[PDB]
Ligand binder design. Structure first.
Ligand SMILES: [Ca+2]
Ligand SMILES: [Ca+2]
Ligand SMILES: [Ca+2]
Ligand SMILES: [Ca+2]
Ligand SMILES: [Ca+2]
Length: 145
């Protein structure tokens, strides 16, 4: 599951939030960290964040709860990573929109020599805002479906 070095790294991350070293992260402590990073959530917002991680409902996050998170977040991060990178490759000019011309060039590079009407159908299927291009959200929604 985890090496001793992985555990030590995630103990150091936990310690950032567990200000007082009691083995738990409270809403106040999460707020202190958030504030240090430029965001000033309310108590209600902090409670929602704790509730999302607090598997036993005792009101605080312990080390085991924080390991189970962080392994959920990191996997989400690695998926994300990928869809991203792909996307930036299809988006040949980097403007945040995959055009029909871009999609055609990268499909040819993937071995598929497509017509304009084939690529336009691919975009129409995925296009939500109707601009005839694919943005990242459209791209993700179509990949994960
Ligand atoms: Ca604490
Ligand atoms: Ca707020
Ligand atoms: Ca708990
Ligand atoms: Ca583009
Ligand atoms: Ca679009």
């Amino acid at each position: 599951q985890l090496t001793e070095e992985q555990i030590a790294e995630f103990k150091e991350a936990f310690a950032l939030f567990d200000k007082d070293g009691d083995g738990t992260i409270t809403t106040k402590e999460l707020g202190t960290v958030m504030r240090s990073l430029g965001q000033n959530p309310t108590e209600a917002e902090l409670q929602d964040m704790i509730n999302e991680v607090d598997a036993d409902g005792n009101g605080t996050i312990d080390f085991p709860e924080f390991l189970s998170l962080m392994a959920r977040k990191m996997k989400e991060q690695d998926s994300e990573e990928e869809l991203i990178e792909a996307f930036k490759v299809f988006d040949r000019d980097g403007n945040g929109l995959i055009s029909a011309a871009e999609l055609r060039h990268v499909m040819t590079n993937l071995g598929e020599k497509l017509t304009d009407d084939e690529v336009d159908e691919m975009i129409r299927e995925a296009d939500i805002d109707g601009d005839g291009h694919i943005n990242y959200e459209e791209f993700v929604r179509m990949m994960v479906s």
